[PDB]
Amino acid sequence: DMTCTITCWGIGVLLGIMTTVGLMVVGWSFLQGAFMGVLAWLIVGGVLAVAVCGKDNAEQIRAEMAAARERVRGAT
Amino acid sequence: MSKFYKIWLIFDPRRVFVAQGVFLFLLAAMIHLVLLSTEHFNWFELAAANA
Amino acid sequence: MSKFYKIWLIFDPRRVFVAQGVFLFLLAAMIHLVLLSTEHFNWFELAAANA
Amino acid sequence: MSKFYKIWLIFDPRRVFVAQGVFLFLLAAMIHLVLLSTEHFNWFELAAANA
Amino acid sequence: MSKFYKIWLIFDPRRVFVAQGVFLFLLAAMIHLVLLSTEHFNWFELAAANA
Amino acid sequence: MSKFYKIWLIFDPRRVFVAQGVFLFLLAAMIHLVLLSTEHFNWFELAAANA
Amino acid sequence: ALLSFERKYRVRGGTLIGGDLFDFWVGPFYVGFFGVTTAFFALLGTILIFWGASQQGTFNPWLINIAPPDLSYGLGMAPLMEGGLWQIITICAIGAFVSWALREVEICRKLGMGYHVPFAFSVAIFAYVTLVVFRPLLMGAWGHGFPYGIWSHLDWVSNTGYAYLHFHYNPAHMLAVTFFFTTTLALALHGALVLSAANPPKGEEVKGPDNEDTFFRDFIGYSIGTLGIHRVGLLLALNAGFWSAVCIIISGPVWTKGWPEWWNWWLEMPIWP
Amino acid sequence: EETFFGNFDLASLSLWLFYGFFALLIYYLQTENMREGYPLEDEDGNTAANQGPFPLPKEKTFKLQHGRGELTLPGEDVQRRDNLALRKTAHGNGFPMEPTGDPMLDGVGPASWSKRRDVPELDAHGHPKIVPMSAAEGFGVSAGTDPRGLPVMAGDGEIVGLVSDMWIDEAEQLVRYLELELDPEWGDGKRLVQRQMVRIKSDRVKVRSIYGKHFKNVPKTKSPNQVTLLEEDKIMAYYAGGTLYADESRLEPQL
Amino acid sequence: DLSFTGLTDEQAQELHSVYMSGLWLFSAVAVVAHLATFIWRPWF
Amino acid sequence: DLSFTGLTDEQAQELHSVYMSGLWLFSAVAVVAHLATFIWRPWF
Amino acid sequence: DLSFTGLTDEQAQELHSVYMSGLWLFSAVAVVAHLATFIWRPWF
Amino acid sequence: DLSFTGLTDEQAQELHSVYMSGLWLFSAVAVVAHLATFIWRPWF
Amino acid sequence: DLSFTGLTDEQAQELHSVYMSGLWLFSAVAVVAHLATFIWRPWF
Amino acid sequence: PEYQNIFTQVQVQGPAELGVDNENNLTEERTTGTGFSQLIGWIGNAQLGPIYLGWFGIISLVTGTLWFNIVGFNMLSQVGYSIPEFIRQLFWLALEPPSPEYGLRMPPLDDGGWFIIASFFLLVSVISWWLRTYQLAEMHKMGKHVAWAFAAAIWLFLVLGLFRPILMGSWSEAVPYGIFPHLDWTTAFSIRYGNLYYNPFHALSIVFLYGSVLLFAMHGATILAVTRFGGDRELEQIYDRGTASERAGLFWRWTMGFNATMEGIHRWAWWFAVLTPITGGIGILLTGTVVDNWFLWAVEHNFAPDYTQDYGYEAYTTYDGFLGR
Ligand code: BCL
Ligand code: BCL
Ligand SMILES: CC[C@H]1c2cc3[nH]c4c(c3C)C(=O)[C@H](C(=O)OC)c4c3nc(cc4[nH]c(cc(n2)[C@@H]1C)c(C(C)=O)c4C)[C@@H](C)[C@@H]3CCC(=O)OC/C=C(\C)CCC[C@H](C)CCC[C@H](C)CCCC(C)C
Ligand SMILES: CC[C@H]1c2cc3[nH]c4c(c3C)C(=O)[C@H](C(=O)OC)c4c3nc(cc4[nH]c(cc(n2)[C@@H]1C)c(C(C)=O)c4C)[C@@H](C)[C@@H]3CCC(=O)OC/C=C(\C)CCC[C@H](C)CCC[C@H](C)CCCC(C)C
Ligand SMILES: COC1=C(OC)C(=O)C(C/C=C(\C)CC/C=C(\C)CC/C=C(\C)CC/C=C(\C)CC/C=C(\C)CC/C=C(\C)CC/C=C(/C)CC/C=C(\C)CC/C=C(\C)CCC=C(C)C)=C(C)C1=O
Ligand SMILES: COC(C)(C)C(=O)C/C=C(\C)CC/C=C(\C)CC/C=C(\C)CCCC/C(C)=C/CCC(C)CC/C=C(/C)CCC=C(C)C
Ligand SMILES: COC(C)(C)C(=O)C/C=C(\C)CC/C=C(\C)CC/C=C(\C)CCCC/C(C)=C/CCC(C)CC/C=C(\C)CCC=C(C)C
């Protein structure tokens, strides 16, 4: 599922560009906006990749997989 | 609104709890610091001014 | 409010205790340093100015 | 309060003992350093000034 | 206080000795150096000035 | 006081001997240099100024 | 004179151009179309350099200096004594480097292996071309290139570095220096590990990859593997070259003032109290 | 500071000492690298009249693991091929060689292989290093696209079969070979492909080095559970020889 | 029905009840805090 | 009875009680310290 | 009983008692030192 | 008896005895040195 | 008897005797040197 | 195009490897617990840990942490304990070496005492790490090449920090602990003693650094080129020569007229890398103690170039002409 991670990284890059342009609009300079945009890229891209792409596809496999770990625990 | 309990049939409670615990503290810290970055709502400086 | 004890059925108490201790110590150190960073509540300088 | 002994059923004494020793030594060292860094509680300079 | 011997049932007798030796030597050297940095407790300079 | 011989039941004599030799030589050299760095205890300058 | 295992590899084919017209060897060297071009360009450049040295008035290796023209000549041609020989030698050097790269490509094709080495050499060629072509072209004069002298091409570096007050404050210079240092450290560690694995103390058996993996996991807690280390080294060297080129190309045509002043964006952010 | 004579001072002495040390070090480094491939020979297989300015080094001994004996270098060439199907295109030295039969089948040129030992490579425990994935307990795919079950396309667009297994390196947790089951039209049995010469896609695996008709003559392994160094060399080089010998246009000048 | 984590309907109901009670008490404290801040110094 | 750790309902009460007692002791100590600091130097 | 470290109740109580004795001695030493320092040089 | 290093009660007791025997001598030497230093060049 | 390194009681006693003899000789030599140095150029 | 072997197509994961062992019992000090990173698995190995915890490692970690904390707390106190200002000026702060007036005596805490204490801690930590790297190689039954190559850099470290200040008789000759301050020290040291370009040993160190970077680029490209023949398994190629080594050697023999072996190239790499700090330390040790002006030294030794043309802008153009007026 590397494609979803690459999509999240691209979304983060686009969000960084948008935030940079917005910071130009507010009244900052190029580098001041660029630094905050890069921050936003890395933070939001990492968060989305860990969270959204961590929801691997499963409908009934997830429940028994969740239930299986509920049995290993409680006796260890 | 009586069927809001189904969100626990989809979302993992532990991950959501960790995310909320991080987010609430972060938002509280940012709000307090933003209140500290002004002049009218800075109690540390207000105490010195009134001393 | 009377069913708050169920939180330990979700999170392992070891990690919670370690994180709580680390967070409390770091927050206390940060708050003491912030109080040191000002002039009104700098107790060492206040003692120096009263002698 | 009387059930505080149960911490040893959750935490290994060997690791927490070393952690406590290291933390106590570091805290004492930094507090003594902070005292030495000031002009009001520097005993070495107080000895020279008095005599 | 009469049952402090049980620390050897928790810790190895060799690691403690090595750590204690290194710690003692480092602390003694640091304290002697700190003493040498002042103008009132430097035995070399006091001997030089008293001649 | 009379049972200090047991230290050899814990420490390997080879490592202790090597460390002792290195430590003794380094400490002697460091003390000699520290004396040489002063004006009162430099025997070469004292000999030069004697004549 | 061939190696004891070389004869079976000396077959015909794998030429980009020329066929069997230049398909032979001279001693150990392999000759082709690009070998002929390389020989011609290199010999012409060397003989022109020594002609310029003779006309300068010194044959001392430390003191030979061939310099670019003055800034007043612009991008045009200068008299051959007032800096035109430098332009001719630059053309010859570019041709020789390109021919060398293409000869390496032909050798790789004949041996049936990958084309990584010419690609790596292309980055050094790019850095040289940025030094002598792209930056002078953007600045508007051929006189911005460095002279061809052993000890006179360091005075140019010094004066160009001091033209911006403090060149250590260039961020791309920081990146390039960090890459250089990291590459040197990685090479040292790789060589030491391989040599130690293949050369144990006397009377002991040789080791294998498992032993090296254990060693570095015991040492620092992570091992990159026998295949990842080569990728890492190649990438580090290529990044060092690329960022050196970027650092030299942003200094003149993009930034004009001193480099320490560039940090005023950080020093004057609105977030600070 | 003063000078010993003229302009000679401590710095000059250090520089000259470094010059001498560097000369000796260069001699040592060059001599150390002449333990394989010497003495030199001419194009007729005889010893050449010229051997260079660096004399041969002295002998060193390697003590190998798993009781495989010792290796002493420099020495005789034990990896030498015996009968090569090659022909001289000139009466003197410095000219290429001409294949006599089928270069891909005769192992000459870019298809050449070395006569290595006919035993598998062992790990620290003494087991064969490369093992099929169906005999490795606890191993599974963790990332990327699983190639098992996908069709295989040759260098000319022909489908020859399906990927049936992978051969992995247990010690280093890396995939080494991909096993292929051939259609009856294109041959019989199974063949191995090294991982460095394949491109796994979402619906297919492509091998651009050789064509469809060259798949039946890939060297086969003697055992279904292990592979030796000699077999790996012959399989791997057969696959490399197709970059030049699979077509007439790959050998002639591209222009 | 639509279980993903391994919960039953009544288990989810109990979880929701406890969580909502805690959240509403936490907000009840903050409401008094906000009224105290407004009384000390209005900001509107 | 849901459990993502393995603890039982009976076991998950004594630990909560001890944790609550520790929290109450910490809160009392903090309240005393804050009252002393407010006496020494007010900030409101 | 619940025990993640393989210890019994009585051993834990003994270790807690010894640790408490050590903590009380350390706290007494710290209190004496603080009183002496405050007498020598007040900071409040 | 609870143990983690393999030592017994008597071995630990003897080791502690000799350890404190050395520690008391070290502390006495340090105390004598400190008193001599205070007599020579007082602080506080 | 306890033994970590692997020696016995008698070997340890003999080694300690030799070590202490050498240590006493070295300490006596150092004491004489220090006394001579203090007479030559005294500190304190 | 053909696969270039820069990123792995498919990853596989099995049971974690705990490591080899012998009668020295390396297992008793190794930790328990490992992880897997799929992000790093695209380039190299995915398993993370475990690590070996001796006494040298713990001592080095603790003492280096002490040095770090001392420097950081001094920098924090220098700014008034203001966290926003500490963050704002992080790259500009430092812990300055003592003043020149104190010679080699111990200076006060305000003018270099903390610097000396932190330097002592850093020295102890570095020596402990070197001892650990020697001990590990001694217990796994291997050569000690890693220890020698570390000692090569420790030599320059000590020359820059310990030996030269003692030879010059002042603790003020050391390097400050800061990001921009240390670059400032580099530039000021270069200016103060003539031109460091004309120091021959700086030139030799530059030569070896360039050669080392060139050699890793070449070796990485060569190994990735012949990886289709199992060329990354270098040890088995050394013990039993295959076609990959022959092709790799023949490439360079046909390119430049001479080549190497699979084992001899690593000797070349080791020496080019090691020779840089050695020459650098030798060159640094001679500055000030022997030579005080390197341009004058070059002039006296007749390898300083001479220029004929003139100086000044008025010899080439006009002020109004530059402005376009
Ligand atoms: C006052 C001086 C300034 C300064 C001014 C500059 C300037 C100005 C430059 C840099 C450049 C560089 N600086 Mg700086 N720099 C300073 C001091 C330093 C310090 C330090 C103090 O420690 C370091 C580590 C560096 C290091 C570096 C590298 C990051 C970089 C070198 C380029 C390179 O290697 O490209 C290597 C690439 C090549 C050019 C190789 C070309 C090879 C060709 C293709 C093949 C040759 C064939 C040959 C003729 C064959 C003949 C031989 C036959 C056998 C006969 N600088 C000081 C602070 N720095 C340089 C840079 O970035 O250049 C782009 C540069 O010009
Ligand atoms: C204006 C600047 C001056 C100049 C001033 C200097 C000075 C001054 C020096 C250098 C030095 C060097 N110069 Mg010069 N140099 C100039 C221009 C250049 C240019 C250029 C213009 O392109 C180049 C290529 C270089 C590059 C170089 C290197 C060849 C050499 C560094 C040796 C080395 O191995 O460093 C690598 C660094 C080290 C090995 C340091 C030691 C590392 C130790 C082991 C660190 C221990 C670890 C630590 C304690 C723990 C950290 C925490 C961890 C995370 C746990 N210089 C100009 C002319 N140069 C050095 C030298 O040797 O010159 C003779 C030196 O001192
Ligand atoms: C440039 C070399 C320097 C270095 C490098 C280094 N150390 C490393 C690594 C690297 C590259 C690791 O990958 C590894 C590590 O775990 O990193 C997170 C590690 C490590 N070196 C360590 C310490 C260490 N190394 C030291 C030495 C050094 N570190 C060298 C000087 C020192 C010093 C100077 O004293 C110390 C204190 C440990 C913190 C760690 C050893 C790993 C270990 O024992 O257990 C780790 C395994 C786990 C329990 C799980 C993985 C850890 C993750 C952080 C948690 C979960 C993440 C997930 C599983 C994937 C991670 C994502 C990736 C992006 C990392
Ligand atoms: C041949 C010369 C080259 C070289 C070689 C070299 N360096 C080496 C070695 C070798 C052969 C080692 O074996 C050794 C090593 O461990 O390598 C992995 C090392 C090393 N060279 C290093 C640095 C280094 N090398 C450099 C350069 C060079 N070293 C040369 C180019 C340079 C520069 C300026 O160019 C630097 C900065 C280290 C990475 C390492 C030495 C490790 C050491 O001494 O550690 C001592 C411990 C401490 C100071 C404690 C630090 C405590 C920290 C505050 C936290 C713990 C560390 C943590 C991993 C960092 C923070 C992580 C965060 C996530 C929190
Ligand atoms: C593991 O794997 C690996 C290996 O393997 C095991 C390796 O080994 C290596 C390689 C690494 C090493 C060997 C380590 C050492 C390397 C270095 C230190 C790198 C630095 C190298 C150098 C400084 C030396 C490089 C030298 C060069 C580039 C010059 C050599 C070139 C020539 C002399 C000319 C080239 C010849 C040509 C073009 C053919 C001639 C042209 C013709 C037209 C032929 C027609 C005939 C004539 C013109 C007349 C006859 C010609 C003659 C006699 C030629 C000479 C002419 C002169 C004028 C002198 C690596 C990396 C590796 O990872
Ligand atoms: C690690 O994780 C786990 C789960 C185990 C934990 O959560 C563990 C947690 C701990 C181990 C926590 C431990 C906490 C402490 C030991 C806290 C101790 C706190 C104090 C001793 C605080 C003392 C504060 C004193 C103050 C603020 C004094 C102020 C004095 C004045 C302002 C002067 C005014 C004048 C007068 C006369 C007042 C008189 C003095 C008084 C103190 C009332
Ligand atoms: C940073 O702040 C400044 C600079 C102001 C400071 O200076 C700060 C300073 C401090 C914070 C200092 C703190 C100092 C301490 C906490 C010091 C503590 C010291 C000790 C606990 C020392 C203990 C020493 C013990 C000794 C010497 C024991 C010796 C024992 C023996 C010689 C006998 C042992 C032999 C045995 C067991 C053999 C028997 C073997 C058997 C098998 C039976």
Ligand SMILES: COC(C)(C)C(=O)C/C=C(\C)CC/C=C(\C)CC/C=C(\C)CCCC/C(C)=C/CCC(C)CC/C=C(\C)CCC=C(C)C
């Ligand atoms: C490593 O692990 C193990 C377990 C092995 C250990 O812990 C081993 C530990 C050791 C082997 C430790 C060894 C320690 C030593 C050998 C320590 C030795 C210490 C000294 C010899 C200290 C001497 C100190 C002397 C001093 C401070 C003298 C001062 C003199 C004056 C100040 C003069 C002034 C005198 C006046 C005015 C007269 C009045 C004085 C009166 C006392 C009345």
Ligand SMILES: COC(C)(C)C(=O)C/C=C(\C)CC/C=C(\C)CC/C=C(\C)CCCC/C(C)=C/CCC(C)CC/C=C(\C)CCC=C(C)C
């Ligand atoms: C490495 O591991 C092992 C176990 C092997 C070891 O640890 C081995 C260790 C050794 C083999 C160590 C060996 C050590 C030596 C051989 C040491 C020798 C030391 C000396 C010979 C020291 C001599 C010192 C002499 C001095 C200080 C002379 C001073 C003279 C004056 C100051 C002159 C002025 C004198 C006056 C005014 C007279 C006053 C003196 C009177 C006595 C009245």
Ligand SMILES: COC(C)(C)C(=O)C/C=C(\C)CC/C=C(\C)CC/C=C(\C)CCCC/C(C)=C/CCC(C)CC/C=C(\C)CCC=C(C)C
């Ligand atoms: C981690 O994940 C999980 C799911 C577990 C969580 O989300 C857990 C979350 C928690 C454990 C959260 C815990 C939260 C707390 C413990 C919060 C505590 C909050 C306080 C104690 C807040 C106190 C606020 C006090 C204030 C604002 C005082 C103000 C005083 C003045 C302004 C002084 C002037 C007052 C005047 C004049 C009185 C006038 C006011 C009137 C209302 C009349």
Ligand SMILES: COC(C)(C)C(=O)C/C=C(\C)CC/C=C(\C)CC/C=C(\C)CCCC/C(C)=C/CCC(C)CC/C=C(\C)CCC=C(C)C
């Ligand atoms: C001013 O602002 C700044 C930030 C600068 C500050 O200075 C901030 C400072 C702080 C925030 C400081 C905070 C400090 C603390 C919270 C300190 C807490 C300290 C403790 C809780 C200490 C506890 C100590 C306990 C001890 C010493 C107990 C026992 C010791 C023993 C040696 C007992 C021995 C035990 C044995 C042998 C076990 C028995 C074994 C068996 C097998 C049964």
Ligand SMILES: COC(C)(C)C(=O)C/C=C(\C)CC/C=C(\C)CC/C=C(\C)CCCC/C(C)=C\CCC(C)CC/C=C(\C)CCC=C(C)C
């Ligand atoms: C306070 O906030 C927290 C807790 C977060 C912190 O701790 C923050 C910490 C930081 C922000 C820290 C930042 C640290 C740096 C930016 C550090 C930079 C350090 C350097 C650039 C260091 C360079 C060191 C050395 C150099 C360049 C060369 C040589 C040095 C030496 C050989 C040193 C050895 C010294 C010796 C041998 C002398 C010792 C003296 C004796 C008398 C023995």
Ligand SMILES: [Fe+3]
């Ligand atoms: Fe290699």
